[PDB]
């Protein structure tokens, strides 16, 4: 019923600096707003209830404010454990509690374009009657990245699977795999397969392609 929107899905910050997350209600919640932190290991901890009331056991770095339909969570002097996901939830009436979609909080890195590779269906798979084309986009920052496939220069978003790794902990980049699956029949009919990556750093798309009629 009462909807809760967190503007942003992920944001990038840096050690020792200040981060703000905003929650917008769809109607007034009279200050009954809480925030939680979900660690990547999956643990969840309450941080702040009733807008600003800080839960004991929780660092003073975390403070919350807001009223009516707008609320924000602030982390001052962000430090390492804080790298996590943050949900707001309104508990105005029970059982109609709602949660924001989450805001992912990661450490800001220099911005790296992805290294990109495209792969034709293995002959072994061609005997199945199946045909998957795969594209890897490796080692990029920030997470935001749009990849779109094109067969014979015409887009396809049908039967694509996109999979993101965790921000690599040793190096703070991301990688993703994108798979387009077709029948072997469709596969033979067309000739050029393309995988087009668009990134903060692109500016135009990075593309990696191939042609089955050599």
């Amino acid at each position: 019923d009462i909807v809760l929107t967190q503007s942003t899905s992920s944001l990038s910050a840096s050690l020792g600096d200040r981060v703000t997350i905003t929650c917008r209600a769809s109607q007034d919640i009279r200050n009954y707003l809480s925030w939680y932190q979900q660690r990547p290991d999956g643990t969840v901890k309450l941080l702040i209830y009733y807008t600003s009331k800080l839960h004991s056991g929780v660092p003073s770095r975390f403070s919350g404010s807001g009223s009516g339909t707008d609320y924000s969570l602030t982390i001052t002097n962000l430090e390492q454990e804080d790298i996590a996901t943050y949900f707001c939830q309104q508990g105005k009436t029970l059982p109609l509690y709602t949660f924001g979609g989450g805001t992912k909080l990661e450490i800001k890195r220099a911005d790296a374009a992805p290294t990109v590779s495209i792969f034709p269906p293995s002959s072994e798979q061609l005997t199945s009657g199946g045909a998957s084309v795969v594209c890897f986009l490796n080692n990029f920052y920030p997470k935001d990245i749009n990849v779109k496939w094109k067969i014979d220069g015409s887009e396809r978003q049908n039967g694509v699977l996109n999979s993101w790794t965790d921000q690599d902990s040793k190096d703070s980049t991301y990688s993703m795999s994108s798979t387009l699956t077709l029948t072997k029949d469709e596969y033979e009919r067309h000739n050029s397969y393309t995988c087009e990556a668009t990134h903060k750093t692109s500016t135009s798309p990075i593309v990696k392609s191939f042609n089955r009629n050599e």
């Binding site: 009954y32 809480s34 939680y36 979900q38 999956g42 643990t43 969840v44 901890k45 309450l46 209830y49 009733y50 009331k53 839960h55 996901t85 949900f87 939830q89 508990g91 105005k92 029970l94 059982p95 109609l96 509690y97 949660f99 979609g101 989450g102 290294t115 590779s117 495209i118 792969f119 034709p120 269906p121 293995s122 002959s123 072994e124 798979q125 199945s128 998957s132 795969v134 890897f136 490796n138 699977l161 999979s163 993101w164 790794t165 990688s175 993703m176 795999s177 798979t179 699956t181 191939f210 042609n211 089955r212 050599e214």
Partner: protein, 214 residues
């Protein structure tokens, strides 16, 4: 203060399941309690709640059609009967203590760690492993599709190339799971020397070693 859930696991479509949550470190019968679930699209939603004594229960949906909550105050235990289950009930389920100040209950001050529940009628199926030679420094791949249940393990060569390897998390497609893995190696020289992804799926007792092929 503690909350340990259990009862999770694989179950077939239409199946039933009773989750339990054992509580300690506080006076169980003094608190409202509740279950929250997290979808793999990591949204969070309340499943059900119940008052101190157990007489009043609260459901967004549907009262006994799907989920039923209950508690045994003598046993410091909280229960959730799930029945008649679908795929989209696949989620991680949390036990959470509800907290009020003044006297609305509005936030969830303590959280269990969660039980994973998988809802699938899938049969244990072993993976097809397909090497990915590019087309058409060098990056290679291994597609691993059509398996159930999760998970598998991929290792490149044996693997000497421990680093420069990405493993992409699996996704549910056409009832089964698909994942993929890449590795980067020096152009000079390959395929002067061979590369293998070895894949293991213990749930089907399969081990498949695949030579990379142009």
């Amino acid at each position: 203060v503690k909350l340990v859930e259990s009862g999770g696991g694989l179950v077939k479509l239409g199946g039933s399941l009773k989750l339990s949550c054992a509580a300690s470190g506080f006076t169980f019968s003094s608190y409202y309690m509740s279950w929250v679930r997290q979808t793999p699209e990591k949204r969070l939603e309340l499943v059900a709640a119940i008052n101190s004594n157990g007489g009043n229960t609260y459901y967004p949906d549907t009262v006994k059609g799907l989920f039923t909550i209950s508690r045994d105050n003598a046993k410091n235990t909280l229960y959730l009967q799930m029945s008649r289950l679908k795929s989209e009930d696949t989620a991680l389920y949390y036990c959470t203590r509800l907290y009020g100040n003044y006297v609305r209950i509005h936030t969830m001050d303590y959280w269990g760690q969660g039980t994973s529940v998988t809802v699938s009628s899938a049969k244990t199926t072993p993976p097809s492993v397909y090497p990915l030679a590019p087309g058409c420094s060098v990056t290679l791949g291994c597609l691993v599709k059509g398996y159930f249940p999760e998970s598998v393990t991929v290792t490149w060569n044996s693997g000497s190339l421990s680093s420069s390897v990405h493993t992409f998390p699996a996704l549910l497609q056409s009832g089964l799971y698909t994942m993929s893995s890449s590795v980067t190696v020096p152009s000079s020289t390959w395929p002067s020397e061979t590369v293998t992804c070895s894949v293991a799926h213990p749930a089907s007792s399969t081990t498949v070693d695949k030579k990379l092929e142009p």
